[PDB]
């Protein structure tokens, strides 16, 4: 079951990352456009632009980063 939970996990990361990438991309762009629009609309939120970019992408990508991260953290590192 090691080779299965090994390949299945890695492979799961691919699917998970992709599916999560799609959904993540969709939402990031969703809230990203609106938030980015306002902030980018207000000259005083220029730093918000970048800050929000990383925050929205990171918070959304934190999910697969956490799943994949935890997986490989113990798998590739601890296994």
mmCIF file of C-alpha atoms in Angstrom:
data_model
loop_
_atom_site.group_PDB
_atom_site.id
_atom_site.type_symbol
_atom_site.label_atom_id
_atom_site.label_comp_id
_atom_site.label_asym_id
_atom_site.label_seq_id
_atom_site.Cartn_x
_atom_site.Cartn_y
_atom_site.Cartn_z
ATOM 1 C CA UNK A 1 0.000 0.000 0.000
ATOM 2 C CA UNK A 2 3.074 2.215 0.263
ATOM 3 C CA UNK A 3 3.615 2.461 -3.488
ATOM 4 C CA UNK A 4 -0.110 3.137 -3.876
ATOM 5 C CA UNK A 5 -0.377 5.750 -1.135
ATOM 6 C CA UNK A 6 2.909 7.104 -2.472
ATOM 7 C CA UNK A 7 1.995 7.473 -6.139
ATOM 8 C CA UNK A 8 -1.652 8.143 -5.300
ATOM 9 C CA UNK A 9 -0.590 10.962 -2.982
ATOM 10 C CA UNK A 10 1.903 12.563 -5.385
ATOM 11 C CA UNK A 11 -0.570 12.112 -8.196
ATOM 12 C CA UNK A 12 -3.289 13.417 -5.904
ATOM 13 C CA UNK A 13 -1.172 16.523 -5.464
ATOM 14 C CA UNK A 14 -1.166 16.965 -9.235
ATOM 15 C CA UNK A 15 -4.934 16.597 -9.516
ATOM 16 C CA UNK A 16 -5.484 18.492 -6.263
ATOM 17 C CA UNK A 17 -3.122 21.257 -7.351
ATOM 18 C CA UNK A 18 -4.718 21.444 -10.776
ATOM 19 C CA UNK A 19 -8.322 21.357 -9.613
ATOM 20 C CA UNK A 20 -7.395 23.695 -6.785
ATOM 21 C CA UNK A 21 -5.495 25.806 -9.298
ATOM 22 C CA UNK A 22 -8.584 26.141 -11.442
ATOM 23 C CA UNK A 23 -10.912 26.956 -8.564
ATOM 24 C CA UNK A 24 -8.237 29.059 -6.901
ATOM 25 C CA UNK A 25 -7.594 30.916 -10.150
ATOM 26 C CA UNK A 26 -11.299 31.528 -10.656
ATOM 27 C CA UNK A 27 -11.852 33.028 -7.213
ATOM 28 C CA UNK A 28 -8.554 34.899 -7.005
ATOM 29 C CA UNK A 29 -9.538 36.549 -10.236
ATOM 30 C CA UNK A 30 -13.072 37.011 -8.913
ATOM 31 C CA UNK A 31 -12.299 38.815 -5.651
ATOM 32 C CA UNK A 32 -8.940 39.845 -7.065
ATOM 33 C CA UNK A 33 -10.474 41.926 -9.819
ATOM 34 C CA UNK A 34 -12.946 43.677 -7.526
ATOM 35 C CA UNK A 35 -10.469 44.257 -4.687
ATOM 36 C CA UNK A 36 -7.614 44.989 -7.073
ATOM 37 C CA UNK A 37 -9.937 47.332 -8.962
ATOM 38 C CA UNK A 38 -10.842 49.417 -5.925
ATOM 39 C CA UNK A 39 -7.351 49.462 -4.459
ATOM 40 C CA UNK A 40 -5.874 50.100 -7.874
ATOM 41 C CA UNK A 41 -8.604 52.680 -8.345
ATOM 42 C CA UNK A 42 -7.394 54.521 -5.261
ATOM 43 C CA UNK A 43 -3.805 55.832 -5.708
ATOM 44 C CA UNK A 44 -3.365 55.340 -1.942
ATOM 45 C CA UNK A 45 -3.855 51.560 -2.234
ATOM 46 C CA UNK A 46 -0.988 50.898 -4.667
ATOM 47 C CA UNK A 47 0.813 48.895 -1.938
ATOM 48 C CA UNK A 48 -2.512 47.184 -1.412
ATOM 49 C CA UNK A 49 -2.232 46.030 -5.015
ATOM 50 C CA UNK A 50 0.779 43.828 -4.386
ATOM 51 C CA UNK A 51 -0.201 43.058 -0.797
ATOM 52 C CA UNK A 52 -3.648 41.948 -1.915
ATOM 53 C CA UNK A 53 -2.235 40.053 -4.871
ATOM 54 C CA UNK A 54 -0.068 37.839 -2.669
ATOM 55 C CA UNK A 55 -2.676 37.628 0.118
ATOM 56 C CA UNK A 56 -5.549 36.565 -2.148
ATOM 57 C CA UNK A 57 -3.415 34.167 -4.183
ATOM 58 C CA UNK A 58 -1.601 32.899 -1.124
ATOM 59 C CA UNK A 59 -4.681 32.430 1.052
ATOM 60 C CA UNK A 60 -6.385 30.585 -1.794
ATOM 61 C CA UNK A 61 -3.217 28.660 -2.671
ATOM 62 C CA UNK A 62 -2.547 28.050 1.010
ATOM 63 C CA UNK A 63 -5.074 25.221 0.801
ATOM 64 C CA UNK A 64 -3.133 23.048 -1.724
ATOM 65 C CA UNK A 65 0.057 24.405 -0.221
ATOM 66 C CA UNK A 66 -1.093 23.035 3.125
ATOM 67 C CA UNK A 67 -2.329 19.721 1.739
ATOM 68 C CA UNK A 68 0.597 19.244 -0.602
ATOM 69 C CA UNK A 69 2.969 20.801 1.906
ATOM 70 C CA UNK A 70 1.877 18.518 4.731
ATOM 71 C CA UNK A 71 1.908 15.540 2.424
ATOM 72 C CA UNK A 72 5.433 16.031 1.086
ATOM 73 C CA UNK A 73 6.633 17.396 4.422
ATOM 74 C CA UNK A 74 6.130 13.930 5.870
ATOM 75 C CA UNK A 75 6.398 12.039 2.593
ATOM 76 C CA UNK A 76 9.390 13.413 0.695
ATOM 77 C CA UNK A 77 11.039 14.675 3.896
ATOM 78 C CA UNK A 78 9.928 12.287 6.631
ATOM 79 C CA UNK A 79 9.541 9.388 4.174
#
